[PDB]
Structures are given as structure tokens and as C-alpha cells.
Design an enzyme around this catalytic site. Structure first.
Site, mmCIF file in Angstrom:
data_model
loop_
_atom_site.group_PDB
_atom_site.id
_atom_site.type_symbol
_atom_site.label_atom_id
_atom_site.label_comp_id
_atom_site.label_asym_id
_atom_site.label_seq_id
_atom_site.Cartn_x
_atom_site.Cartn_y
_atom_site.Cartn_z
ATOM 1 N N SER A 61 24.659 -2.246 -32.406
ATOM 2 C CA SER A 61 23.638 -1.542 -33.191
ATOM 3 C C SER A 61 23.898 -0.067 -33.566
ATOM 4 C CB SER A 61 22.276 -1.718 -32.534
ATOM 5 O OG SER A 61 21.792 -3.051 -32.765
ATOM 6 N N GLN A 117 16.171 -11.403 -34.450
ATOM 7 C CA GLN A 117 17.358 -12.086 -34.919
ATOM 8 C C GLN A 117 17.037 -13.016 -36.075
ATOM 9 O OE1 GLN A 117 20.185 -10.807 -33.789
ATOM 10 N NE2 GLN A 117 20.725 -11.611 -31.739
ATOM 11 N N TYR A 147 11.670 -3.176 -33.696
ATOM 12 C CA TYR A 147 13.133 -3.183 -33.843
ATOM 13 C C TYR A 147 13.649 -4.560 -34.257
ATOM 14 C CZ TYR A 147 18.055 -1.928 -32.731
ATOM 15 O OH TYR A 147 19.405 -1.658 -32.783
ATOM 16 N N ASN A 149 17.035 -6.816 -36.366
ATOM 17 C CA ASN A 149 18.216 -6.992 -37.185
ATOM 18 C C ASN A 149 17.902 -7.656 -38.517
ATOM 19 O OD1 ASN A 149 19.914 -5.870 -35.174
ATOM 20 N ND2 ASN A 149 20.106 -7.891 -34.166
ATOM 21 N N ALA A 315 24.800 -2.480 -28.462
ATOM 22 C CA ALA A 315 25.469 -3.414 -27.557
ATOM 23 C C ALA A 315 25.842 -4.718 -28.241
ATOM 24 C CB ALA A 315 24.613 -3.693 -26.316
ATOM 25 N N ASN A 340 28.581 -4.264 -21.547
ATOM 26 C CA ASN A 340 27.198 -3.933 -21.854
ATOM 27 C C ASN A 340 26.448 -3.531 -20.573
ATOM 28 O OD1 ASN A 340 24.605 -3.681 -22.860
ATOM 29 N ND2 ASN A 340 24.351 -5.845 -23.412
#
EC number: 3.5.2.6
Length: 358
Positions: A61, A117, A147, A149, A315, A340
Site C-alpha cells: 500500500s 478487496q 480504507y 483497494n 504490506a 510483514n
């Protein structure tokens, strides 16, 4: 490396590596327009290959900062506006929930609950369309930050449409090349594989396996050297040659939304400097940075505040990255590791170091 830097870096990073059990790590400290590098451990444990200033790490990210800056440059070129409806760049997106959803919304995780996701199930052009048509918002636009993606990744794909380039091509020619980021890649080419670190999950060697829009959301791989240069660029954007790229960086560090002490930029997240380490340290975990949070609109957005802590964590399965800088002190840090490990730890360590140098 000047006594002050060397002392604090080694004091801070060594214990971290030991306690978190990180196989390989690289660090850059940026101090008055000069980078200083430090490496530890292994990029490939099995073949005993060391970490170097040429090792490639998965940024995860932290890749969103490059996405935010590429969008920024598209705005500065007058190719897009954050105030434009998503619909203007994806006309097939006809479902009624998209009406007041703008590129700003997408870029800043404020569209109304776009999911973290994209489902693995998504494989084609039409698969991805169905996914966004059928998505049902929990909230009105511009009221909560979640948050995601699926959100900034879509912003990425749309922000490059008027150029006509693919996302990788637009990133390479408008951001990477002009900033001399010559060892930074979305797809690692065969010539660089020898420099590509393995990540380690449960003692297993792993590389990321990108699905739909991962390029846009977390697909950048880079070296400690290119990352310091990226930090330098973000610290002093007005020293940059290309006019729109200069603007684009500044736009990525504008403050669009507030939640607590945190301000959301394009890719970047910022806080007022000076800060309380505890204010950042508990602003990142699997349940903190990934929580639903009400936002206040910043009307109109504050342009890049020199007196800020600007940062991003990232990560993948096998990697963990951190970047932070303070424009008003000409100072920043990058931390790249092939395990990670916990975000608070990352921020703790970055904090120790920059506080003592500033």
C-alpha cells in the site's frame, strides 16, 4: 554518516530486527537533501543473498502514494478533475448509486463503503463492471472513510483514461522516468529478478500474486535508493522540473478530509507537526486503519502543509514497508523489510529516529 544519524539509526533499528525477527531490512534517512543508507540481513535466505541498496522490495500500500501522485499530475494536466463524477470516465456505470460519486470520493475512500478487496472471482472487463454495478453503498458519499483497494484502485484506472496510456505506461513515463526512479517497477522484468527479494510468511518464500487493480492499489516494487529519491521529491516538489508533476505532488499532500488527528491526502496521510507518537502509533492496526470512520470535509482543502508528518504504511503477504517525512525540517525516513510485521512498531521506530534528528 554524521554521528547524530548513525547513533540513532543503529540504536533504533537493530532491536526492532531482533524482536520482530525480520530476515532482511533496508533503511534510508533523508537529512537536509542527502540520503543515508543502511542494510541488514538477507533478501534470499536459501541462496544467502544479502540486502543491498539494489534489493527490490514489495511496497504494498505504499504504492498508493505513486497512484495519488499520478492522479495529481493528471489533474495538473487538465486531463481530469477530482470534482468530476465517476460516470464521466466509465459511462457504462449506469446504476443509480453512482450519481454523486466523484473521483475525489474514490481517491480518498469516501465513496460510501467500497470493499477492501476486489473479489478474487473478478477476472475480466465485464466481471469488474458487474462488480461495481452491483455494489450497494452503506453510506452517502463524503460521510465516512473506509480504507479500500477497490476504491483508490478504480481511481487509478480511471485517472489515466484521457491520456490513452495504460496505467503502467502512464506511471513509467510521467512519474518514474522524470524522477529518475530507474529501479522501480510494477512488473519486475527478467533482468531484475536477481535483485528481487523473497518475502517471508511463516518461514515460507512468497511473492505477491496480483488480481484485479492490484497494480493501482499495491503493485509497486522498489529499492531503498529509489525510495529515498521518492521521499526527497515529496519533501521538495518545487525543485522538480516537470510542471504538472510538481503540482501533482503538492495535490497529493493536500488535506481533503479529517478524522481525529489524521488528514486524508491522495495516497498520503498527514498529521500536524509536532505530533504525539501515540497519535500515529494507534492509527494503523488491522482494526484502526481498516475501520469505518466519520469524516469532516475540509472546505476548501488545505494545500500541502509544510508543518506536517506525512506518511504511509504498506504490506504484502511477505513484506512490510513504511515511509514518513516532515517537509519543514527537510527530513524523512524509509523502512523496507521482507517480513510483514506490526505497523505500530514501524511508526515507533520511525518516530524515535526523526524526532532526535529534527
Amino acid at each position: 554518516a554524521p554521528q547524530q544519524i548513525n547513533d540513532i539509526v543503529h540504536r533504533t533499528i537493530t532491536p526492532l530486527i531482533e524482536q520482530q525477527k525480520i530476515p532482511g531490512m533496508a533503511v534510508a534517512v533523508i537529512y537536509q537533501g542527502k540520503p543515508y543508507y543502511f542494510t541488514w540481513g538477507y533478501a534470499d535466505i536459501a541462496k544467502k543473498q544479502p540486502v543491498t541498496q539494489q534489493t527490490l522490495f514489495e511496497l504494498g500500500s505504499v504504492s498508493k502514494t505513486f497512484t495519488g501522485v499520478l492522479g495529481g499530475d493528471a489533474i495538473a494536466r487538465g486531463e481530469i478533475k477530482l470534482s468530476d463524477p465517476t460516470t464521466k470516465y466509465w459511462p457504462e456505470l449506469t446504476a443509480k448509486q453512482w450519481n454523486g460519486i466523484t473521483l475525489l470520493h474514490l481517491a480518498t475512500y469516501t465513496a460510501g463503503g467500497l470493499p477492501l478487496q476486489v473479489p478474487d472471482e473478478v477476472k475480466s472487463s465485464s466481471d469488474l463492471l458487474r462488480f461495481y454495478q452491483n455494489w450497494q453503498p452503506a453510506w452517502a458519499p463524503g460521510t465516512q472513510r473506509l480504507y479500500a483497494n477497490s476504491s483508490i484502485g478504480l481511481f487509478g484506472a480511471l485517472a489515466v483514461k484521457p491520456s490513452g496510456l495504460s496505467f503502467e505506461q502512464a506511471m513509467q513515463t510521467r512519474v518514474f522516468q522524470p524522477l529518475k526512479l530507474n529501479h522501480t517497477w510494477i512488473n519486475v522484468p527478467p533482468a531484475e529478478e536477481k535483485n528481487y527479494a523473497w518475502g517471508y510468511r511463516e518461514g515460507k518464500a512468497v511473492h505477491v500474486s496480483p488480481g484485479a487493480l492490484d497494480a493501482e492499489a499495491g503493485g509497486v516494487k522498489s529499492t531503498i535508493e529509489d525510495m529515498a529519491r521518492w521521499v526527497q521529491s515529496n519533501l521538495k516538489p518545487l525543485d522538480i522540473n516537470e510542471k504538472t508533476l510538481q503540482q501533482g505532488i503538492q495535490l497529493a499532500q493536500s488535506r481533503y478530509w479529517q478524522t481525529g488527528d489524521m488528514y486524508q491526502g491522495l495516497g498520503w496521510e498527514m498529521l500536524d507537526w509536532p505530533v504525539n507518537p501515540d497519535s500515529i502509533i494507534n492509527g494503523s492496526d488491522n482494526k484502526i486503519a481498516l475501520a469505518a470512520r466519520p469524516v469532516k470535509a475540509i472546505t476548501p482543502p488545505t494545500p500541502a502543509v509544510r508543518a506536517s508528518w506525512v506518511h504511509k504504511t504498506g504490506a504484502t503477504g511477505g513484506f512490510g514497508s513504511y515511509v514518513a517525512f516532515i517537509p519543514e525540517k527537510e527530513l524523512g525516513i524509509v523502512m523496507l523489510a521482507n517480513k510483514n510485521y506490526p505497523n505500530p512498531a514501524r511508526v515507533d521506530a520511525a518516530w524515535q529516529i526523526l524526532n532526535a534528528l529534527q
